[PDB]
Paper text:
Transplanting the AYC motif into mPlum to generate mPlumAYC resulted in a mutant protein that was completely deficient in red chromophore maturation; i.e., red chromophore formation was essentially undetectable by either absorption or fluorescence spectroscopy. The absorption peak corresponding to the anionic red chromophore, which is at 588 nm in the spectrum of mPlum, is absent in the spectrum of mPlumAYC. This variant instead displays peaks centered at 396 nm and 508 nm; the 396 nm peak corresponds to the neutral green chromophore, and the 508 nm peak corresponds to the anionic green chromophore. When excited at 508 nm, mPlumAYC displayed yellow fluorescence at 527 nm with a quantum yield of 0.02, and no red fluorescence was detected with excitation at 590 nm. For mPlumAYC, however, no such peak is observed, indicating that the intermediate blue species does not form and that the second oxidation reaction does not occur. Thus, introduction of the AYC motif into mPlum prevents red chromophore maturation by inhibiting the second oxidation reaction, which results in a dim yellow fluorescent protein containing only the green chromophore. The structure of mPlumAYC demonstrates that the intended π-stacking interaction between Tyr197 and the chromophore was successfully introduced. The centroid-to-centroid distance between the Tyr197 phenol ring and the chromophore phenol ring was 3.0 Å and the interplanar angle between these rings was 12.3°. In mPlumAYC and mPlumAYC-E16A, the presence of Tyr197 blocks the space where the NZ atom of the Lys70 side chain in mPlum-E16P and mCherry would sit. In these AYC motif-containing proteins, the side chain of Lys70 forms three H-bonding interactions: one with the side chain of Glu148, another with the side chain of Tyr197, and a third with a water molecule. The AYC motif therefore appears to lock the side-chain amine of Lys70 into a position over 6 Å away from the chromophore.
To create a further red-shifted monomeric RFP, we investigated whether the AYC motif could red shift the emission wavelength of the far-red emitting RFP mPlum. mPlum is a member of the mFruit family of monomeric RFPs derived from DsRed and differs from mCherry by 13 mutations (excluding N- and C-terminal tags). Its fluorescence emission wavelength (λem) of 649 nm is the longest of the mFruits and is red-shifted 38 nm compared to that of mCherry (λem = 611 nm). Ile65 and Glu16 appear to be major contributors to mPlum’s long emission wavelength as replacement of either residue results in an up to 40 nm hypsochromic shift. These residues interact through an H-bond between the side chain of Glu16 and the acylimine carbonyl oxygen atom of Ile65, and this interaction gives rise to a dynamic Stokes shift that is responsible for the far-red emission wavelength of 649 nm. Chromophore maturation in mPlum results in a mixture of protein molecules containing either the red chromophore (λ = 588 nm) or the green chromophore (peaks at 391 nm and 506 nm).
Residue numbers in the entry: 7 to 65, 69 to 222
Write the structure that this text describes.
């Protein structure tokens, strides 16, 4: 059911520091090569009053290149699919938590996402929009408690020139008990490839590849 080319559709709804929004997206990629692009639009509550960059990693692990000998748990979860839940703790006390459902219908991946951001300082780089995308990330993947966990430190580049840091923990759970992998790493790079002024229209590109640790 996972072809060498696959599209996806995404609906995200959320709030950050009280500001409500919805985003719709359509994307496409090559799941066995670890590569994907997407076009996204803010459909309600745009222009966003905070950094797009805190949303970009919430907006697709079906598209991770896996060697032969690492069970690709997330592809094997389809057509039913998988749920994930995440928390990002940012250095200045900001917090993002995400709940997500992924499935496959009519030959395309369907993503349904709920995002809540809170406690970001008003004078911070997130509410002031002073960020400049993510550095490459390596996610520590390991089985625990019948689910696949991931942990990562992410570094958001700052326009003034430093970095702004977040510690991340996610639980990924297939809807049927398909084969969990052993411990490994997933190397990411995510790039914003286009945005309009106010970031109500945004394109992204991501590559991700798994490897033994
Ligand atoms: Cl169908």
């Amino acid at each position: 059911v996972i072809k060498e080319f696959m599209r996806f559709k995404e609906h995200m709804e959320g709030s950050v520091n009280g500001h409500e929004f919805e985003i719709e997206g359509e994307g496409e990629g090559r799941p066995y090569e670890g590569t994907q692009t997407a076009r996204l639009k803010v459909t309600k509550g745009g222009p966003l009053p905070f950094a797009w960059d805190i949303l970009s990693p919430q907006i697709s692990k079906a598209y991770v290149k896996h060697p032969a000998d690492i069970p690709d748990y997330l592809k094997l979860s389809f057509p039913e699919g998988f749920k994930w839940e995440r928390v990002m703790n940012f250095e200045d006390g900001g917090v993002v938590t995400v709940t997500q459902d992924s499935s496959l219908q009519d030959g395309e991946f369907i993503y349904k996402v709920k995002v809540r951001g809170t406690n970001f300082p008003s004078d911070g780089p997130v509410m002031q929009k002073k960020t400049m995308g993510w550095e490459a990330s390596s996610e520590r993947m390991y089985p625990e408690d019948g689910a696949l966990k991931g942990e990562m430190k992410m570094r958001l580049r700052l326009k003034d020139g430093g970095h702004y840091d977040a510690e991340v923990k996610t639980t990924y759970m297939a809807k049927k008990p398909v084969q969990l992998p052993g411990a490994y790493k997933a190397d990411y790079k995510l790039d914003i490839t286009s945005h309009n002024e106010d970031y109500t229209i945004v394109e992204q590109y991501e590559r991700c590849e798994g490897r033994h640790s």
